[PDB]
Structures are given as structure tokens and as C-alpha cells.
Design a protein around this ligand. Structure first.
Ligand SMILES: [Zn+2]
Ligand SMILES: [Zn+2]
Lengths: 52, 7
């Protein structure tokens, strides 16, 4: 699986956690690849590096 | 934000 992060660490396993940018680009990222936790994912907004 | 889980 590949996400939109600069260094998508190509997470290869069953069950992958994703998060989408609110900042505009509306692209998807592996939560691992952007270093965020599920709580941070569901409770608050995420602005990616390009949309920041 | 919007999250997703892929299996
Ligand atoms: Zn990734
Ligand atoms: Zn973005």
C-alpha cells in the first residue's frame, strides 16, 4: 500500500489505518507514515505538510 | 478528521 506521504514507508500488513487531509489537497495518508495516533485522527483535524 | 481502515 502506498500513501501520499513523501516517504511512504510502504506499510505491508493486514489492516491499515488511513487519515485524510482537511487542509485542502484531500489526499489520503497512512497514519503511521505521518506519525499520528487514532485518537488524534478521530478527535481533531489533520493538516498535511503541503496544506499547512 | 476522516479516517479509514483497509484490510
Ligand atoms: Zn504511506
Ligand atoms: Zn493536504
Amino acid at each position: 500500500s502506498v500513501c501520499a506521504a513523501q516517504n511512504c514507508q510502504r506499510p505491508c500488513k493486514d489492516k491499515v489505518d488511513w487519515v485524510q487531509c482537511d487542509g485542502g489537497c484531500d489526499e489520503w495518508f497512512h497514519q503511521v507514515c505521518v506519525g499520528v495516533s487514532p485518537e488524534m485522527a478521530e478527535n481533531e483535524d489533520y493538516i498535511c505538510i503541503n496544506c499547512a | 478528521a476522516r479516517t479509514a481502515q483497509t484490510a
